[PDB]
Design a binder for this molecule. Structure first.
Ligand SMILES: [Zn+2]
Ligand SMILES: [Zn+2]
Lengths: 274, 274
């Protein structure tokens, strides 16, 4: 009956379903773990979202997302930090296993990528006490390098782990195959993450050939070229046995299909291709 | 009169100009270094291209390109290796400072990215004796990670340098800001390249915000977010003082403008923004 070890990031059916319907279809397929987004939670209301979570015994593999730290001035940086505190409060209410952090790109006008990265480290450090007090692990999600300028300037698992080592307890990593599959040093950095006890989440999807859009053409698992099986074996060998979270952005395919069929296909591909 | 230290990769005006006209406009602006592509050379003829090169005293900062090593079988891999030998012969005829190598993506159907990378190393090793005998340095060009699956599975300068160390003399790197600007370890790897005496080329352009296409929306220098000045200072500190090669693929902007204006703008932006 239950599909053990599978979570659905609700972006996967974001065009078709708001929060309650997404949960309903996931439960209809034996799925008891989700990762909602803050806008989806806000649209239903945080209190109702947590009631649904607690009533159905749902695990949250993550809440998406905090981050977005760099800004051209102190006021803007603190506005971002303070938003992350709200995100932590939301995650805590929902019992999320972590708050996913998407670092933010360059401050407007700036070319100073190293400074942007320092603002990320400082921003995480500013949020950490709030997160630790709330019992909410912070998961730095290294993002594909194509996102460096304008979405997230933490772009390798090695770099993410360097930040985890600098900041100390309460911060780990979310390993999303879309963002990291290409990294020539991926095997060593997964092993490193495991030694650090830093792995908080594992997101799955695929890299299509060709990829037709930089943001909204993620593949269903098995439709692309990622060695999903190999990555998962390495993550398990590193000591992480949590659910695999399906996170697909697909403007011209999966978002245009009935949510039922999408989730059915996620379960099939999870069984066969992961 | 002369614009010292500037080269134009002829992709920059590829829609507007074949080889002879491209050279003419570059010389009209005081530019005496180019990097043509093999298709452009073939369209005019290798003999005529070399005559033009020798008559005008042109430097070639590169010939684009060899590579494309991985294939599902030995016959296909050897076909690729043998093409690279032809590319070396072309580079030698034109007096090119290097042959740029774009590694190739995964063999069709395969998910085995590590094996693809082994085929790259083996392929370069197979070509090297031909290149060394011809006097043609091979320049491994790490490519942006977004190209990993289907164009080039050498995706970081560190990885490129690892291959250079494995293979030994006659192989170095082409450092293209588009492909490497995001790398969190870029400063250390540029310094490393310099210690290895491995830097063979420096390609310039910019990363736009937003980037509107994965292949054909490179920016004119200064229109994007790359710290061009900083990268160049590090390349010079590492011991490379060769020309900066402008390589812009811009389907909706620079390729639609008069070649004259494009090259004029390259010289202005080279002066101000590099
Ligand atoms: Zn993710
Ligand atoms: Zn290049």
């Amino acid at each position: 009956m239950q599909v053990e070890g599978l979570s659905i990031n609700l972006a996967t059916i974001r065009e078709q379903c708001g929060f309650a319907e997404a949960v309903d279809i996931c439960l209809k397929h034996g799925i008891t773990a989700i990762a909602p987004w803050r806008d989806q939670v806000a649209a239903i209301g945080l209190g109702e979202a947590g009631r649904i979570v607690r009533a159905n015994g749902l695990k949250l593999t993550g809440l998406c997302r905090g981050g977005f730290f760099p800004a051209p001035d102190a006021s803007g940086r603190e506005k971002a930090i303070d938003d992350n505190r709200r995100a932590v409060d939301e995650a805590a209410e929902l019992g999320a296993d972590c708050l996913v952090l998407v670092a933010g790109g360059l401050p407007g006008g700036s070319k100073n990528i190293d400074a942007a990265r320092r603002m990320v480290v400082e921003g995480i450090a500013a949020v950490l006490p709030h997160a630790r007090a709330a019992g909410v692990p912070l998961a730095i999600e290294p993002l594909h390098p194509m996102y460096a300028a304008d979405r997230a300037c933490v772009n390798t698992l090695g770099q993410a782990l360097d930040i985890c080592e600098t900041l100390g307890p309460g911060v780990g990593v979310a390993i999303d195959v879309y963002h990291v599959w290409w990294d020539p040093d991926l095997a060593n950095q997964i092993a490193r993450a495991g030694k650090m006890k830093a792995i908080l989440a594992h997101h799955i999807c695929d890299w299509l050939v060709p990829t037709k859009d930089m943001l909204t053409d993620r593949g269903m698992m098995g439709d692309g070229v990622i060695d999903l099986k190999g990555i998962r074996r390495r993550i398990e060998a590193a000591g992480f046995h949590g659910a695999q979270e399906v996170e697909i952005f697909s403007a011209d395919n999966w978002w245009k299909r009935p949510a039922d069929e999408v989730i059915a296909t996620c379960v099939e591909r999870y069984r066969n291709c992961c």
